[PDB]
Design a protein around this ligand. Structure first.
Ligand SMILES: CCCCCCCCCCCCCC(=O)CSCCNC(=O)CCNC(=O)[C@H](O)C(C)(C)COP(=O)(O)OP(=O)(O)OC[C@H]1O[C@@H](n2cnc3c(N)ncnc32)[C@H](O)[C@@H]1OP(=O)(O)O
Ligand SMILES: Cc1c(C(=O)CCc2ccccc2)oc2cccc(OC3CCNCC3)c12
Ligand SMILES: [Cl-]
Ligand SMILES: [Mg+2]
Length: 385
């Protein structure tokens, strides 16, 4: 297929491949003064709207649009159902701009029918740190698909981002676009085996009976690392040092400030869970994962699959396998049905032994206006939401 929109943008062509030593923008020497000051045109009867995510009622409208129209699995059995409070956390990180939270309304109903967002973050790509926008929650209402609205959303946020003298973005999608810098399969570890069977997610066979399936996935309710505990404000500096050091080995990662650590890690029920092991007042090991339920479409008995998504995990006192086994246990202890991760960082190495199953597709990582060698997902050190 043709990429008639993407090919007009500063991203690689589908055939482009770059040496390791290439690491630079497609278009350099950009000037804020030259950026269009006019909003991009929407079709007749539709308007831009600046969402205030801190306002319960605006935040709810975004919640509704995503609950009804956001990403579905290939088989349209499941639809991501990010919670309102999770969207608050995801969009109000350090230095967020309200004007990067862009909705589109249909004038006559006053209804939100589109959305796109970005937050600022410093991104280290092949050892060069660059200020970028992380883009997420692009969504057009199901009733308005394939009408070329999405490039309008993209072009408008790009314009707003450029106004802040920012010229690169990072983003992820399951769809293949020009052109990933990396590609990571997702893996899933069953926690509530029976529920996962009943909604079709997992399956049985003549050898794996229901009772045998339950037994296979049984976990012991005892932590390998005894003192692993919810993170507290006191733990911010330790976490910053532990994580910040660990992340330097990767080809792609966020450079977190102390302020970004407190925001991205301090726990929030039903949103973010971070656990630490403190020894001698030092943080030596951490586990984290975020909550991302999916709505279950057309199952008579269950309407929600609660799922925990591996975020950042670092051990210096245990094996990485022992640490992730603890991450599974803490997710079970918090009522999650399943523990999801990507084959990024060291993850892949523990998936077989910990009984993860390979999923159906993969998550592509993309950069905007950035030219560089692609790499295997083990070299990816950032997890987007
Ligand atoms: C320096 C700053 C730079 C800032 C910007 C950085 C870039 C940020 C990029 C965004 C990052 C988002 C990351 C993110 O949020 C995580 S990926 C999740 C995206 N959201 C969903 O999948 C929700 C369900 N689907 C929808 O809502 C609609 O299908 C959407 C809105 C996806 C498209 O609506 P539509 O009604 O289906 O489509 P048209 O309007 O007709 O438009 C079609 C054009 O859209 C291209 N398309 C489709 N899906 C895309 C996707 N996921 N990324 C980028 N492009 C995507 C497509 O290839 C085509 O271009 P082409 O003709 O060249 O092929
Ligand atoms: C997208 C995804 C999946 C999936 O299985 C994608 C298919 C799906 C879509 C909607 C509802 C349920 C399933 O598994 C993951 C396991 C780990 C991380 C993942 O990606 C995250 C980062 C980008 N946004 C979604 C979560 C994923
Ligand atoms: Cl244009
Ligand atoms: Mg459209």
């Amino acid at each position: 297929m043709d990429y008639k929109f993407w090919y007009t943008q500063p991203v690689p062509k589908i055939n482009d491949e770059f040496n390791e030593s290439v690491n630079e923008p497609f278009i350099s020497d950009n000037k804020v003064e030259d950026v269009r000051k006019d909003e991009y045109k929407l079709p007749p009867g539709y308007s831009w709207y600046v969402c205030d995510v801190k306002d319960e009622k605006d935040r709810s409208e975004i919640y509704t649009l995503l609950t009804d129209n956001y990403v579905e699995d290939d088989d349209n059995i499941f639809r991501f159902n990010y919670s309102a409070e999770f969207l608050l956390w995801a969009l109000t990180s350090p230095n967020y701009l309200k004007t990067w939270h862009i909705g589109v309304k249909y004038d006559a109903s006053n209804k939100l029918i589109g959305f796109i967002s970005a937050i600022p973050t410093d991104i280290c790509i092949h050892k060069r740190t660059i200020k970028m926008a992380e883009v997420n929650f692009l969504c057009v209402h199901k009733t308005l698909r394939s009408k070329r609205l999405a490039p309008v959303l993209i072009k408008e946020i790009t314009r707003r981002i450029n106004l802040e003298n920012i010229w690169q973005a990072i983003y992820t999608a399951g769809v293949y676009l020009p052109k990933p810098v990396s590609d990571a399969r997702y893996y899933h570890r069953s926690i509530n085996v029976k529920k996962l069977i009943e909604i079709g997610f997992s399956s049985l066979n003549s050898r794996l009976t229901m009772s045998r399936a339950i037994k296979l996935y049984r976990v012991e309710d005892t932590l390998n690392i005894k003192n692993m505990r919810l993170m507290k404000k006191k733990d911010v500096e330790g976490v910053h040092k532990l994580l910040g050091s660990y992340l330097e080995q990767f080809n792609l990662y966020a450079v977190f400030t102390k302020e970004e650590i407190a925001h991205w890690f301090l726990p929030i029920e039903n949103v973010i869970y971070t656990y630490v092991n403190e020894e001698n007042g030092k943080i030596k090991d951490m586990i984290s994962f975020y909550s991302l339920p999916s709505q279950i479409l057309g199952n008579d008995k269950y309407s929600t699959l609660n799922a925990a998504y591996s975020f950042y995990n670092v051990t210096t006192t245990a094996t990485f396998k022992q640490l992730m086994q603890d991450a599974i246990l803490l997710a079970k202890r918090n009522n999650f049905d399943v523990f999801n991760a990507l084959e990024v960082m060291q993850n892949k190495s523990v998936f077989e032994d910990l009984k993860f199953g390979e999923g159906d597709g993969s998550l592509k990582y993309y950069l905007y206006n950035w030219k560089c060698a692609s790499f295997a997902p083990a070299h990816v050190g950032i997890v987007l939401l």
